[PDB]
């Protein structure tokens, strides 16, 4: 086995060809950004989730 | 009635209801 796959079809692991050691692959940190605003009428201050 | 001893503070019936209803799937999605 060369490259693993999870319950979905994404690749979660790969075998190092040169060192024959297994590496878990995790896609780099990501997410959604939500902006909490009191209203531009009130203030321009925001919070970030 | 809520059960104070248990941390969730749920009733026994509520705890049974919560137990019955149920790379991870969530992680992949």
From Swiss-Prot, chain B:
- What name goes with this protein? Spike protein S2
Which part of the complete protein is shown? Answer: 806 to 853 of 1273
> What is the purpose of this protein?
Precursor of the fusion protein processed in the biosynthesis of the S protein and the formation of virus particle. Mediates fusion of the virion and cellular membranes by functioning as a class I viral fusion protein. Contains two viral fusion peptides that are unmasked after cleavage. The S2/S2' cleavage occurs during virus entry at the cell membrane by host TMPRSS2 or during endocytosis by host CSTL.
Site positions for Cleavage: 10-11
What taxonomic ancestry is recorded? Viruses, Riboviria, Orthornavirae, Pisuviricota, Pisoniviricetes
């Amino acid at each position: 086995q060369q490259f693993g796959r999870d319950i979905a079809d994404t690749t979660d692991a790969v075998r190092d060809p040169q060192t024959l050691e297994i590496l878990d692959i995790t896609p780099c940190s990501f997410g959604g950004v939500s902006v909490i605003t009191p209203g531009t009428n009130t203030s321009n201050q925001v919070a970030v989730l | 009635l809520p059960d104070p001893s248990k941390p969730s503070k749920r009733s026994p019936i509520e705890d049974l209801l919560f137990n019955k209803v149920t790379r991870d799937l969530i992680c992949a999605q």
